[PDB]
Amino acid sequence: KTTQPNSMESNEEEPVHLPCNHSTISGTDYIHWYRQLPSQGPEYVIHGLTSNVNNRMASLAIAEDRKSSTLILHRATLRDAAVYYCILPLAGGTSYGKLTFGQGTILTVHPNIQNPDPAVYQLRDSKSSDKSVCLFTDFDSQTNVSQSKDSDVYITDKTVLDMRSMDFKSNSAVAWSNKSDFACANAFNNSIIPEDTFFPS
Amino acid sequence: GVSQSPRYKVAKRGQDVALRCDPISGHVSLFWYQQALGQGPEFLTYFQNEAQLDKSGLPSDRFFAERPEGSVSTLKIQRTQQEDSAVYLCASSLGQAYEQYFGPGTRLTVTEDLKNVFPPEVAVFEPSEAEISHTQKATLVCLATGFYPDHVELSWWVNGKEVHSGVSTDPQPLKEQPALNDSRYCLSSRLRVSATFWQNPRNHFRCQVQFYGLSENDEWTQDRAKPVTQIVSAEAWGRAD
Numbered sequence A: 001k002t003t004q005p006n007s008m009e010s011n012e013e014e015p016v017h018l019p020c021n022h023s024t025i026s027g028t029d030y031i032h033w034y035r036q037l038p039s040q041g042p043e044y045v046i047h048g049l050t051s052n053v054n055n056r057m058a059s060l061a062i063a064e065d066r067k068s069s070t071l072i073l074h075r076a077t078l079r080d081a082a083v084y085y086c087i088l089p090l091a092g093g094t095s096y097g098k099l100t101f102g103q104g105t106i107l108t109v110h111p112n113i114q115n116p117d118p119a120v121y122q123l124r125d126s127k128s129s130d131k132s133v134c135l136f137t138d139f140d141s142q143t144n145v146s147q148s149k150d151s152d153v154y155i156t157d158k159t160v161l162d163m164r165s166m167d168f169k170s171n172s173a174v175a176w177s178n179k180s181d182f183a184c185a186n187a188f189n190n191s192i193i194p195e196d197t198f199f200p201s
Numbered sequence B: 001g002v003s004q005s006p007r008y009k010v011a012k013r014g015q016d017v018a019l020r021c022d023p024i025s026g027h028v029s030l031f032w033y034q035q036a037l038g039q040g041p042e043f044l045t046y047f048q049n050e051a052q053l054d055k056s057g058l059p060s061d062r063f064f065a066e067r068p069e070g071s072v073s074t075l076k077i078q079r080t081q082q083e084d085s086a087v088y089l090c091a092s093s094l095g096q097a098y099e100q101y102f103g104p105g106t107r108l109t110v111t112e113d114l115k116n117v118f119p120p121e122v123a124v125f126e127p128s129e130a131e132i133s134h135t136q137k138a139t140l141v142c143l144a145t146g147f148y149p150d151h152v153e154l155s156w157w158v159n160g161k162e163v164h165s166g167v168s169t170d171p172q173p174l175k176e177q178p179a180l181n182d183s184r185y186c187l188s189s190r191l192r193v194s195a196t197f198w199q200n201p202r203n204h205f206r207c208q209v210q211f212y213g214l215s216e217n218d219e220w221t222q223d224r225a226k227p228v229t230q231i232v233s234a235e236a237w238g239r240a241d
Helices: B129-135
Strands: A007-011 A016-022 A031-036 A043-048 A058-062 A068-073 A082-087 A105-110 A119-122 A132-137 A159-163 A168-177 B003-005 B008-012 B017-022 B029-035 B042-048 B051-054 B063-066 B073-077 B086-093 B106-111 B121-125 B137-147 B152-158 B161-163 B167-169 B185-194 B204-211 B230-237
Touching (some): A007 A016, A068 A082, A132 B137, A159 B185, A168 B137, B042 B073, B073 B086, B129 B137, B137 B230, B152 B185, B185 B204
Antiparallel strands (some): A031 A082, A058 A068, A119 A132, B003 B017, B017 B073, B063 B073, B137 B185
């Protein structure tokens, strides 16, 4: 049995230390790390019985008292955002390689926005839709988007959009509703947004 | 690598289903897992060649697995219940000293009645003229709504070619009616391009939503069109303005 923090945040290019707690493991027990990207099946990352075990992407560290381990990602990128699982399997006896995945830790990797340009835009309505769409975009990664206080207003959580052609990343969230009182000016009122956010007029 | 089929499956409560796994050739070990939403994979059963040495994870007798020739394995679930809704994962490894390779998974949704199944309606929202003037960029938004189950794959196509750069799609479909257990879903996606690219009337943009629903083997007695696997798209052409 192992435990890990529920989630962790990191910025692109920064190294990341993902901790794991466990009962004292013998010098013959191995620690395994797997990860799972969005809508994909899990994938092996690394495993070992000592520290200084590594590969391109990461390294494994095991505390001196063997009561905790750490997966170290040397240089996190957006693609490293995923759920990371620390697994402590059985070794010897009647063991066959069974792996017990716990809840893992959710790693979110935020882009480094060089020139924040927060703004809320209204997109052109669609003929076949009765919904009005508002786009909150280009804000710094520290900004959080909250859910609306209305059941008739849908707001997505923030996501990163990467325009690789121009080496340009941006954060954004969308809000939509068919209500009459719905306007982009108030769409994100339940969120703490930059005071200098641009609202076209 | 490891393959699984079907990739998506919607079943009526009480019906039986069979999930297939085609592991990597020569891999002696095969593992099955059940992964509920927001949870980690839970072990179901293990095979060493054709021998199912550890099946301590099977929930009940409704679950049965086989791997007759030590290669392909089938996980069968009889009299499916709503609680069976999950992504079933299969993995294989050469042996205990080696790592596990996972399949893409089979997403199973068990519903009370197939009349709950609906394909998505899709709409594209053209860029804000203000964004174009302010940033020299143009963001299009695609909204897929009213579908059930949440078995969809959204993609963008520009001038007949799929694009990956500049696209950001929500990780998971949102419930339109959180209180209802059979609530339909909505999903959004964004495609951002340069203002000059959007201003070219020759550029054609299409948001495509692949929906996985009923098959020919599923009965349908409703008045509306059978909600079979299909794609639903919405389009927009560049605009000079």
